[PDB]
Design a protein around this ligand. Structure first.
Ligand SMILES: [Mg+2]
Lengths: 93, 131, 63, 86
RNA sequence: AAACUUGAGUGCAGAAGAGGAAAGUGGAAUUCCAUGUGUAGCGGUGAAAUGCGCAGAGAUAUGGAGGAACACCAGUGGCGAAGGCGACUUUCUGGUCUGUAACUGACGCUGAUGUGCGAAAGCGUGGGGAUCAAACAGGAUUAGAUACCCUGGUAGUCCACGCCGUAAACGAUGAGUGCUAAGUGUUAGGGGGCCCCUUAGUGCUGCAGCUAACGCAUUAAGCACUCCGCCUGGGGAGUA
RNA sequence: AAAAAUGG
């Protein structure tokens, strides 16, 4: 079963911090027997509306395949806890 | 589901007669074929054909209309029914339309008309009235 | 008239295809009705779902 | 149930190769479906709509079992003791 | 007792869906709260008043708290046995339709008694509480006004688990099956050359036939067969 | 979009 995870990181993130964060969350999406088919970055994009008072956001796309959704659930829980990721969504197909 | 093929056949004939159709295809059975042949012999239908196809077979009736397009078959009535079956003795055989109609009967001597039932002095299950 | 998706043969609508979605979105952001855009109902459903997904991901505006 | 599991069940219970419509196969598949929906309902108690389909499946399986018992008692006994559905 | 495949199911290839249950995430608006500016009203009605404001209201700008419902799409469109189901995402799960004809070979229909679901209000325990709003309180209207109108406002409306089991719970039309002119739209498919045919729904118009009439009319209220429920003048009374 | 009852 495939999953596309899109998330937005706050526009005021330093390069090194952003790299660390994306590495951490890709590892999270990879942990629970889920293979990250491919991760990529769409750069910093203008948001159609202010989210948490931010007009811009770094857009990260990840596609991961798994037979369950433990990795996606952990990603969503840690993204909710995180104050660096603004938005996230998971689509099955 | 289907519960009276004889009634279904009679109702097919009635509906086709109302609409003044010429032919009539229905699923076949031995009792239906005997009824159709009796109708032909008596003159209520023009012709009967049997198609020995796969499955059940087919009966193809051809109806008869008189001059001025007058319908030969005035009405058909199922008498004995799955919910209540009717049998009659030879001395109690009914006359349809004072004799102008036929009562199709099922007897130990084959399915015949009420005239033949009275002549042979037998009774049986009154399948239907046709006038 | 003719349906854009039926003519082009596209059998899927991607919620990240903002350029395509902007065609059927209104000036104020409302989703244009099917009777105006000419689209089929089958693909109108997919288009609406994709547009709502995009709104959620802030690609497209609510208002 | 998954189509793979359904294929496994039909393979196990088929009277002969290429047999998918035998009463044994049908009632074994129905038993699997019934158990799966029971496991669903244990977690989702208030799924009345699902439980209705479950009850329809139960009735269909019972009618198949009745027909099998009417046609061949030995097959019926063997099947019920195999599936644990008595 | 023995055979058959059309009914009924199973297999295989597809299709759509606000079908259900549980978590999660959003944006608009209402309310309230805290600030900045600013002042003589705001609100409401047929007209007013109550009320709020001058102790600085209302308006306006920024932020915060919380509950509820999901604008546009949206359509005699879709899904469900019915009640009903409309933001998005994920997980679990029910049903339906289309095409083959491998498979079982009548395994079917109906259904008393039973057993379950069932709008809204209501009840119990616990939580929540924005809005709206029975009761209630003022203000009006009026001969009166235990109303309609206005300003507030509690239960409730929301959630979980129980209970209740009723609605003009309606298409005022039980279920199954077959047969009987046509025209035209729409939803999901399928086959053949924008067109033709076809399956299943969903609308409109319209013969035969039916009806007291109104009307129904392949989604019958027509022609038939099976099973179930129900009626027998009005009131008393859905009462004792 | 104020109010205007009743008639063996
Ligand atoms: Mg008078």
């Amino acid at each position: 079963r495939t999953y596309e995870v899109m998330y937005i990181v706050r526009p005021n993130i330093e390069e090194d911090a952003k790299k660390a964060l994306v590495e951490r969350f890709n590892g999270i999406l990879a942990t629970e027997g889920a293979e990250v088919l491919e991760a990529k970055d769409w750069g910093k994009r203008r948001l159609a509306y202010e989210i948490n008072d931010f007009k811009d956001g770094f857009y990260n796309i990840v596609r991961v395949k798994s037979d369950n959704n433990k990795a996606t659930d952990e990603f969503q829980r840690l993204a909710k806890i995180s104050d660096d990721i603004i938005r996230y969504m998971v689509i099955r197909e | 589901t289907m519960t009276d093929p004889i009634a279904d056949m009679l109702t097919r004939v009635r509906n086709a007669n109302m609409v003044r159709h010429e032919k009539l295809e229905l699923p076949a059975s031995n009792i239906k074929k005997e009824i159709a042949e009796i109708l032909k012999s008596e003159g209520f239908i023009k012709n009967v054909e049997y198609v020995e196809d796969d499955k059940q077979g087919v009966l193809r009736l051809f109806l008869k209309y008189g001059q001025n397009d007058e319908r030969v078959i005035t009405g058909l009535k199922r008498i004995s029914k799955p919910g209540l079956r009717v049998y009659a003795k030879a001395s109690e055989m009914p006359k349809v339309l004072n004799g102008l109609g036929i009562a199709l009967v099922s007897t130990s001597e084959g399915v015949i008309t009420d005239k033949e039932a009275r002549k042979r002095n037998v009774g049986g299950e009154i399948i239907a009235y046709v006038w | 008239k003719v349906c854009y998706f039926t003519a082009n043969g596209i059998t899927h609508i991607d919620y990240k295809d903002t350029e395509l979605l902007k065609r059927f979105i209104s000036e104020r952001g409302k989703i244009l009705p099917r009777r105006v855009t000419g689209t089929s109902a089958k693909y109108q459903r997919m288009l609406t779902t994709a547009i709502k997904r995009s709104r959620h991901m802030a690609l497209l505006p609510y208002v | 149930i998954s189509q793979e599991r359904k294929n496994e069940i039909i393979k196990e219970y088929r009277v002969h190769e290429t047999d998918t419509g035998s009463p044994e196969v049908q009632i074994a598949v129905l038993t699997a479906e019934i158990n799966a929906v029971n496991e669903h309902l244990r977690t989702h108690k208030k799924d009345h709509h699902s439980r209705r389909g479950l009850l329809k499946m139960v009735g269909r399986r019972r009618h198949l079992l009745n027909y099998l018992r009417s046609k061949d008692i030995q097959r019926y006994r063997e099947l019920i003791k195999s599936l644990g559905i008595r």
